[PDB]
Amino acid sequence: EKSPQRIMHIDLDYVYDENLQQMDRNIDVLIQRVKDMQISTVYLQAFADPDGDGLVKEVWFPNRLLPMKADIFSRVAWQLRTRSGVNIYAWMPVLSWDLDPTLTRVKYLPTGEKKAQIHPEQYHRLSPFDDRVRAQVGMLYEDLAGHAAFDGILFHDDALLSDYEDASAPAITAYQQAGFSGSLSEIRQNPEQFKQWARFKSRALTDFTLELSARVKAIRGPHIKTARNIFALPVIQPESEAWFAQNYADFLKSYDWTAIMAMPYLEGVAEKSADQWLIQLTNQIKNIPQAKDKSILELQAQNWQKNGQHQAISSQQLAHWMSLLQLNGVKNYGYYPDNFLHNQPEIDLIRPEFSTAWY
Ligand SMILES: CC(=O)N[C@@H]1[C@@H](O)[C@H](O)[C@@H](CO)O[C@H]1O
Ligand SMILES: CC(=O)N[C@@H]1[C@@H](O)[C@H](O)[C@@H](CO)O[C@H]1O
Ligand SMILES: CC(=O)N[C@@H]1[C@@H](O)[C@H](O)[C@@H](CO)O[C@H]1O
Numbered sequence: 001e002k003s004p005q006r007i008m009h010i011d012l013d014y015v016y017d018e019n020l021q022q023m024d025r026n027i028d029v030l031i032q033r034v035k036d037m038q039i040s041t042v043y044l045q046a047f048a049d050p051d052g053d054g055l056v057k058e059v060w061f062p063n064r065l066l067p068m069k070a071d072i073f074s075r076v077a078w079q080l081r082t083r084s085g086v087n088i089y090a091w092m093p094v095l096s097w098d099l100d101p102t103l104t105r106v107k108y109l110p111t112g113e114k115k116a117q118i119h120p121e122q123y124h125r126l127s128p129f130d131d132r133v134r135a136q137v138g139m140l141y142e143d144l145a146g147h148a149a150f151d152g153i154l155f156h157d158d159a160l161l162s163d164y165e166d167a168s169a170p171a172i173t174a175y176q177q178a179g180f181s182g183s184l185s186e187i188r189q190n191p192e193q194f195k196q197w198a199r200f201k202s203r204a205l206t207d208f209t210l211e212l213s214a215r216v217k218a219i220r221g222p223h224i225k226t227a228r229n230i231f232a233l234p235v236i237q238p239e240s241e242a243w244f245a246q247n248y249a250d251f252l253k254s255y256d257w258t259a260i261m262a263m264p265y266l267e268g269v270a271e272k273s274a275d276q277w278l279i280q281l282t283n284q285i286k287n288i289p290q291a292k293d294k295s296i297l298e299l300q301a302q303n304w305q306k307n308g309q310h311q312a313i314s315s316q317q318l319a320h321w322m323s324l325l326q327l328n329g330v331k332n333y334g335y336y337p338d339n340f341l342h343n344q345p346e347i348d349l350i351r352p353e354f355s356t357a358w359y
């Protein structure tokens with residue numbers, strides 16, 4: 001993969017239309033847009049997400065376990081790879097799949113409550129400590145690998161656990177067999193075990209993704225690249241691994257690419273403070289030898305609302321941030337999401353700061 005990496009992170013929900021002729025024209029416009037952008041890589045959504053409700057119910061490829069909304073991942077992928085000049089990473093949830101109800105869900109232990117529960121503001125994750133979950137998610141990745149050709153896998157940011165998770169019964173068994181003492185409440189407040197417990201969960205998530213990678217590689221071959229989205233806080237505030245179960249050094253060792261969600265508004269940073277936040281992030285990265293060479297900084301192109309009506313970030317603002325990254329010595333970056341239907345971000349404003357081939 002030739003340097004630098006410039007990544008468009010693309011949902012196919014926009015492309016989908018019940019009218020097949022319209023969907024055809026949509027795909028054509030998308031392929032041309034990516035070609036015109038002249039960048040290196042597309043992270044391409046393989047799952048449907050029409051409602052943004054943190055749970056995958058349908059996918060864009062034929063498979064054994066979930067409804068196929070439309071057979072379009074493979075179709076878009078091969079055209080992007082041959083007409084638009086990009087590598088394609090299949091973007092897949094790690095855990096948040098609407099599978100058999102008897103499969104174990106991740107739960108958290110609420111303060112003051114005895115029974116573990118599912119938090120409504122979190123991804124609706126299956127538990128990585130349930131071996132049948134591992135098998136069935138494995139089957140989904142195998143079905144993707146068998147039907148479509150691509151260059152890499154992007155593991156979704158839903159591979160995370162808080163310091164009150166996973167409280168499910170199979171997770172409890174896993175902790176017990178690993179030597180952890182007492183209840184989840186006791187472990188997480190034990191000075192001598194809570195850091196080890198955090199690391200155990202981080203390793204469990206990573207090991208699960210590496211199992212999935214191995215299964216895809218068994219089908220498509222060894223050259224398949226891996227990437228995983230990491231939240232910004234585990235990078236800039238490493239103690240936060242306690243409530244993310246993500247470790248930046250672990251990512252850098254385990255994956256070809258660590259896709260950092262360099263998204264200040266997502267993190268609640270004020271508009272007037274966002275640039276400084278990004279500078280501090282890049283400083284932290286540059287202080288770890290060679291980290292920047294295996295990291296992609298992923299900027300946000302929408303400002304997401306709990307309300308649900310997301311708001312676009314101006315093309316000028318996105319270009320400004322891209323310029324900021326370059327000026328601070330960061331050459332690998334991209335953005336999420338892209339909206340071909342409205343030329344948002346505006347290709348003519350973004351290319352000068354995004355395409356190495358510009359002017
Ligand atoms: C935070 C996040 O993932 N937001 C995405 C949004 O950018 C995208 O346009 C929409 C359509 O797929 O789905 C949402 O989930
Ligand atoms: C509110 C809802 O139905 N689902 C949300 C989803 O929108 C969000 O992307 C995810 C991660 O915060 O958490 C889920 O619980
Ligand atoms: C069958 C099932 O899992 N139902 C849960 C529900 O009990 C919970 O209140 C809600 C919180 O988001 O998430 C649902 O998935």
Ligand SMILES: CC(=O)N[C@@H]1[C@@H](O)[C@H](O)[C@@H](CO)O[C@H]1O
Nearest residue numbers: 161162163164165240242243244
């Ligand atoms: C507020 C803060 O800075 N960090 C908290 C952490 O102390 C807490 O244990 C965790 C609970 O899931 O939520 C984080 O946001």
